[PDB]
Amino acid sequence: GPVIRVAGDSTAVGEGGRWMKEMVEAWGKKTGTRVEYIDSPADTNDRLALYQQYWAARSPDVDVYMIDVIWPGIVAPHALDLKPYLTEAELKEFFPRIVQNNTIRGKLTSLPFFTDAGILYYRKDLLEKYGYTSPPRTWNELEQMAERVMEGERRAGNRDFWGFVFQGKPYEGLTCDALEWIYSHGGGRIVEPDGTISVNNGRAALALNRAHGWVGRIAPQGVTSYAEEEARNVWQQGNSLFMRNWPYAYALGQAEGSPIRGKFGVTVLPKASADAPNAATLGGAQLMVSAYSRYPKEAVDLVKYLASYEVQKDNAVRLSRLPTRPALYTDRDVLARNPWFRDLLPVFQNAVSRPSDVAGARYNQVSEAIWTEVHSVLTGRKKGEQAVRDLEARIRRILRHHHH
């Protein structure tokens, strides 16, 4: 019979790739269909380049791809339109914002699978030890807490201890972290939904200078090479007061044998002042059937299974990843395991999107400009003022003649 072949997620990021393979195997067992799992590199931008090789070749060797929230405008020609395969009722079981995201020129490129939002992880034990009762609400507070706790922990002998870890590597994750910094300083969305390239402003430049100020001070010098997992490893070993990361890190930190089990909470990222907007970058994954799959019926059946209530529930319960079905945020077992899903649901609902809608198929070029210019600030090569001026000019060149 057919072999249905899936590329999606990575065994190099938490449990995602292992779990995905498990879920695909479970569908194959349930339906009596042969399946195969193709692994991917850790970073989303590397995965895009890999999958583009298959798409350029019109390759039938992958039937289902997991695609990033930022990808529908890029990948649409390589996607089978799913609209004819779902009833309106079935589609309404997902968040409408994400279905809209996934719909390009009327083509439903992909089903919503899990969503994602940047959050603050904090060591509750350490906040209590140093006389703090609440996590920080402002970036200045975060810096003050970090300096005090670091001084104390270093003095106590932990030479591995830092105040803050985040994703500073030059890749798509830095675009995510930098949108949060800029937006939380009142600096805008980098490129607004209407097309205005807004980043050349003093608030954005301040946000980037502030982040530079962390490097080698409250954050390790090596933070300029950290993706999700590098940050998570320092944090999970017990060596950081604070971390910015996605929801997946929570279940991993609570696993038996984690040095930090029971010692942490999560909250919204800080912001520059009380009237700035909360910032949590929208992330997450969708499920696409390849336009090149020889087995579209079967592939669609697999994608409906993966996006189903019970598989999303398993993802929430075991991997602390966020459902794309509003019903699951009221499910007793999801909430018992992850009470913070209820506390931070409004943060997830108000997550700020990267400019993938407005940049469309040029989004990856825009993002590479963002992360390279931002990285130049983190490394001390450019000041934020120059970087945002230079980034404005780059993005203007990239998007010249593009209309959404």
Ligand SMILES: OC[C@H]1O[C@H](O[C@H]2O[C@H](CO)[C@@H](O)[C@H](O)[C@H]2O)[C@H](O)[C@@H](O)[C@@H]1O
């Ligand atoms: O949260 C678990 C996921 O982390 C990565 O994906 C997030 O971070 C990317 C940037 O590095 C974003 O583009 C993406 O939207 C986020 O969901 C990782 O790539 C995923 O495999 C993990 O599931």
